[PDB]
């Protein structure tokens, strides 16, 4: 291929500079403002180097310790040319690891480079050609019962994960494949209960092609949008067959770290019994959403009806013939209001701030179609290549990729949007018009994927009062800042959640929560994501300022992909490897 | 272009030309005089191999009116290849009611072998890929019934207020696979299984047991084992997998339910099946009954002199719980088959005095050698890397007519013998009686012909070859005395326990005990090819007797086989069941007549 020669020569110069510990020379091969996003392989971190000077500074600090380095076109792949961009899958090696990557080249200059870590040399996963035999040509069940009785009691785990939802289960499967002895702590009774507990009608709003767990993808006949209990069944059965050590009915009560011994002391209550676990690494996988935001409205003590945060709302059944006011317009607000109307309960939504609304069909086609769809698969974009393609766009410029996508969504769904506005609903498209994904990555909230509620709003079936605040709650009403008085038997506060940092404050200490800082967000200086720029998700899947404390989570996509780089970092430290973190992120917000 | 594509595509259009022309004799003229057309449902509504031009013409003359118009072409995205004078190509075939994949071999301008299969019924395709269910019903409703509610409704109504179309007896690997395929075709089906949980059929075996077939060969439909799954799966890990598979594939699986009896009423077209679901009687009235109770039938119990005199324990291999109770005892196992080898190796690991007593020869193959030389080309990592997917692997194997399979296998097992020659020499020198099939065609051919007579060695044969398991061969049982067993060479073995590892009768014995001896006789022997070899008498039948296809008893079907055959032939059985559920015209051609009652 005519492009293979072009890309391979650029890669050879890069390879030459990297072997020579020539940081400046390597950076000169990039565009002046080019990007190098590294996932563990060079930085022992999740780090995006922006521009030649940052690129050179990383290479000057890391190259001496990783030699010899190779980088070349990936086996079986070829370079392609689109829109003036030369791109190719690549393979990259250090002295202790290998990985795949992706490179984009323009006018002979590296525009973007992705390096990732796939495996640690000598600790490769027993997959494919390396499969365990299973049988020798003490039984398999006996050994499992041995591990169930000894791990966490007579013998301590290397790693403890708090939280057995989708995120901890995926991370646990990955850790199991790396022989990192691990216990998952889950206060629910069974795996999958994290999803069973939602409202009757809930389904995933992300599509199947985007949603796979590691190792066992959903089958070709699995539904596009999975009902909440069908997810539960899958997670429970995934947990069994991937041989996880999963302590259900077990609450984590407290944890602390002793830098002297390098050990945590984690106090749990397993079916009522106190147990003390002493792992070397602690992972919080308690959900990206932390502590509920409770408003401080005048007269909340005067109101004689029920007040619930959206997280304490059981559903519409108890409220036939009653009147509900939902304070909020996020997706929790839309879910709760659509259920109350389907049940024939009087519901009013009170919106103070704008919301980004996207029709499910439009999100699936225009925003996910290129990477996660039947069309994507037929074109060869496998789930792994999709994850790596998305990861290869530096967060700095992703909004630029996204803007045309969500402009097309507005033109397609314009009539839908007009009717929402004519009704008085406050629309936005992210602070910079870059859309749903960027809001999710920046603030983890502020959007609703419409599966039926927005039409109920446009048609007036869900009553809307927007543009107003709450003045006070009276004895049987809530009074809005324009003077409107809404009678209310039940007030639901759909006011969101703080960051995961609240989990650390509640389980470790507020002092440790302060060391760690706000979790999630990019530092984009937009709503609920204050600057300055950090360029990677705050405290996710990477070293934190609290030693041996980690955060895992995200949506099913991010949990699938970044559980790989988190587990490889946990494994590397279990093997006593040298892991010199570059550019460890300084804390700019205590929450 | 491809120069082989043109040759094959021209041969195929002549075939298609003749078929649209209702030219049975002319279409047959396109095969070698003795060519083969193996059909899986698509043309014959049967599993049927047409052998020779006269049979081909007769089938085509009988069926063509029922399946026209027929299209047959090279498969989309595939190309013909030529090797050793043989032209091959994947093909795609459509009828007026169905579509499917096929495979064609051509030599000197004549069709040597044709494989036609049915993949789907037109208008009843599976909800997969582009046709996935949405799962969620978007848009507001007040009559909303959630996924969990509908599932709880079906559990409560099916078999009570509403009868299933099909009932499967047996919830092992075979019934679970078939159940999955039937749920994908919206054939309401109840699995009846007397064990408590799905997967218990594997949990029930001895501690150390693993699959002796490798993972690449073993997948269940729809959810393959993952890339980190072990080659040889321990039995309890197989149990957990089936238990998860049954849950996530939405099977209606009545555990703790024994099937007591069933009878068919040709007037109503209904079965009456009496079950005990947790002790409580239920009466099920399906239109179709599938027996999936395992290929092994009634245990064969020997008639030895003095069995009534022996003062120790006597067990059939199927009644032997394991070595635990026999710490200080002396065991004699009468048999040298696979049950006997498993039981003896377990007794020897536990330090029990065990002697194996062999009368007839056994075929021994090392698990590792089966994996490389017998399965390596189709079911391996190298096969996958070469584009041979599990389904392409299944179709390639199915594309070899059974009449010629034995000669493909002979060089495979000549190679296995040369590789393991010292192993075999030490077994023969120790006095173990070896064979390699009646015509030296090896393990897979015995299995297809008689379903017995072999043991895949995972460690026990070395214990025999080295004398750790004591061997007495070439002998029968003369009599049991009060505390000993006497062999036909005069040896008197002291014995606390005698295990009779003497195999099983045919699967139709299940039909005898659950339906009636008359129905069992009408159905006849199950399994076997009619190969005129040991335990497989002629005449030649060419397909597994009564497997995955219509039987001489109306609305009675048999499902089973190894994980490979269950995976693959459950597709054709479920489609035949689905076609009848939708009231399609299904004219069976060449329905096999019974030549043996058992
Ligand atoms: C309508 C709707 C649709 C959605 N669709 C999708 C979708 O398609 N894809 C997607 O990725 N997300 C979707 N989400 C979001 C989904 O809720 C989260 O993404 C999901 O919960 C992932 O969270 P997690 O596994 O990281 O943590 P969680 O799901 O919150 O689980 C964390 C677990 O930690 C446990 N826990 C907490 N504290 C303790 C303690 N002290 N001791 C022990 N255990 C503890 C909890 O019981 C919980 O089970 C949807 C949400 C809604 C409302
Ligand atoms: C060491 C060893 C290794 C093996 N490895 C393999 C391998 O790798 N691959 C392979 O394919 N095979 C293997 N086998 C063979 C295996 O035992 C059978 O192939 C397997 O059981 C398939 O049978 P099945 O699921 O069709 O029926 P079965 O497993 O026999 O199950 C039929 C079920 O029907 C139930 N049943 C019977 N009567 C009734 C009734 N009246 N009411 C309700 N339920 C009833 C039984 O409880 C049983 O669970 C191995 C065997 C051994 C000993």
Numbering used by the authors:
A (entry chain C): 6 to 142, 149 to 602
B (entry chain A): 5 to 602
Task: Give sentences copied directly from the paper behind this entry.
In the crystal structure, JsFMO appears as a homodimer, with an extended dimerization interface of approximately 2300 Å2, consistent with results from size exclusion chromatography. Four protomers forming two dimers are present in the asymmetric unit. Each protomer appears to be divided into two domains; an N-terminal domain with a SnoaL-like fold and a C-terminal monooxygenase domain (MoD), bearing two typical Rossman folds for FAD and NAD(P)H binding. The two domains are in contact with each other and are connected by a long loop (residues 126–150), a short alpha helix (residues 151–161), and a short unstructured “spacer” (residues 162–170). Contrary to what was initially proposed, the N-terminal domain seems unlikely to be involved in the Baeyer–Villiger monooxygenase activity since it is quite distant from the active site of the MoD. While chains A, B, and C are highly similar with respect to the protein and the cofactor, chain D shows some differences. First, the isoalloxazine ring and part of the ribityl chain of the FAD appear rotated by approximately 15°; furthermore, the isoalloxazine ring appears to slide slightly forward, reducing the space between the flavin and the side-chain of His-216. Another notable difference is the movement of the NADPH-binding domain that, in chain D, seems to tilt toward the active site. No NADP+ is present in the crystal structure, so the movement of this domain must be due to its intrinsic flexibility. The active site of the enzyme is accessible only through a tunnel, with Tyr-458, Asp-217, and His-216 as catalytic residues, a combination not observed before in FMOs and BVMOs.
